[PDB]
């Protein structure tokens, strides 16, 4: 009875799993992430004793 269950009509219950494993480690971001400063001004000004 192959024909009487055509593939167009056999919707098999997939397993609720997405293989969403991509590189997400961002320790460079990780460190210096909780110390992000949200300015209300666009520029970042500071002094540097060059000599």
């Amino acid at each position: 009875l192959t024909n009487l269950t055509p593939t167009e009509l056999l919707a098999n219950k997939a397993v609720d799993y997405l293989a969403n494993s991509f590189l997400v480690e961002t320790p460079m971001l990780g460190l210096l992430a909780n110390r992000v400063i949200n300015q209300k001004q666009k520029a970042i000004e500071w002094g540097a004793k060059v000599a």
């Binding site: 609720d16 799993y17 969403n20 480690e25 961002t26 990780g30 992000v36 004793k49 060059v50």
Partner: protein
């Protein structure tokens, strides 16, 4: 699948994963031009430079490293630059000393929260053969049942952790001073209309591949840029960053030519 049973949610989540990853990668390397590759972020490679010559011959935060040799970083390569020497112990001691002779914190106990980032083929294949050369006795009880052939390891260097990630440029060892490496974001939230079009949820970052995404303080504008068009949602997820390296000779310190 619940991933397809909510594509907009998974589109947001994938955009967030790739947004965190992109920010990491550009913080490593972003020449500072405000385009789709560099985003105007100055990262580390544009802060310190890439080569020993690039530590000079440039400018950061306006201050020219040419006229101001103090504004340069401590990028030092090998015997002949740009040729990937083998990262001897003398090499890291030499860079920490050139960090010491710069009056810049060179130990992890000097109250300035240092860190070291390596291409992660260094933390596992250059610092693992090392530390087999600074010690003579890696003790293991022979009757150890739990005989770990390559144990969990953190690899401090003068108390400076050598946390590594594989988006860091290869053959490099960024000795960062996190106390002078803030991330700065322009918070224009108060200049946005009261309509619930913009939500500003924070960027998430994982330090490992097995831990909670750990919402940060970095906020990301999730704004629907929907039109009068009724059939489209058209969401956007944007963030703008500058990587400031205060005290460039203190923030970034790069070892340039590692064999692997």
């Amino acid at each position: 699948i619940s991933a397809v049973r909510d594509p907009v949610g998974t589109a947001i989540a994938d955009a967030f994963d790739v947004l965190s990853k992109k920010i990491n990668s550009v913080l490593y390397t972003a020449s500072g031009v405000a385009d789709a590759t560099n985003y105007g972020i100055f990262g580390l490679d544009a802060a310190a430079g890439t080569t020993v010559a690039n530590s000079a011959t440039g400018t950061y935060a306006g201050i020219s490293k040419v006229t101001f040799p103090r504004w340069r970083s401590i990028i030092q390569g090998g015997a002949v630059p740009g040729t990937n020497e083998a990262l001897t112990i003398a090499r890291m001691t030499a860079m920490l000393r050139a960090r010491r002779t710069a009056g810049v914190t060179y130990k992890g106990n000097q109250n300035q929260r240092l860190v070291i980032l390596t291409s992660d083929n260094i933390e596992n294949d250059v610092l693992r053969p090392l530390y087999g050369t600074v010690v003579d006795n890696q003790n293991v009880d022979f009757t150890r049942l739990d005989k770990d052939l390559l144990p969990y390891v953190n690899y401090m260097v003068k108390g400076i952790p050598v946390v590594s990630d594989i988006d860091c440029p290869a053959n490099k060892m960024y000795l960062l001073n996190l106390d002078k490496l803030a991330i700065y974001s322009f918070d224009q939230s108060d200049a946005d209309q009261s309509n619930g079009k913009i939500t500003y949820i924070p960027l998430r970052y994982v330090d490992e591949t097995g831990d909670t995404p750990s919402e940060s303080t970095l906020w990301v504008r999730l704004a629907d840029v929907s039109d009068e068009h009724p059939d489209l949602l058209k969401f956007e997820l944007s963030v703008a960053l500058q990587l400031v390296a205060f005290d460039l000779i203190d923030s970034i310190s790069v070892i340039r030519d590692i064999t692997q």
